[PDB]
Amino acid sequence: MIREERLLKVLRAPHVSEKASTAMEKSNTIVLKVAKDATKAEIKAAVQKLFEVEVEVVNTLVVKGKVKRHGQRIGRRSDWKKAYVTLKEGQNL
């Protein structure tokens, strides 16, 4: 095809979180933590194949890890990518 079926392990988790997620459900589109190296087109494919839905276009943004806690030293979390996916019309999941 263009992207091997193997590499469609880019979808990592739904981000069903906040009205941001759900209130932007009730007006098209779904959002997801997705890989890190994922290429919009590369992640559209995943959502076509798996999930078997339609997809108009996909937007991406990177979330930066909050650094916190600790006394002298310090701990940081990992960065990760957001989805915001926007399905064509016969919208299901």
Partner: peptide
Amino acid sequence: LLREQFNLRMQAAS
């Protein structure tokens, strides 16, 4: 992968 691994992540995370 095709099955267990992807379904598991999704199902798990959810």
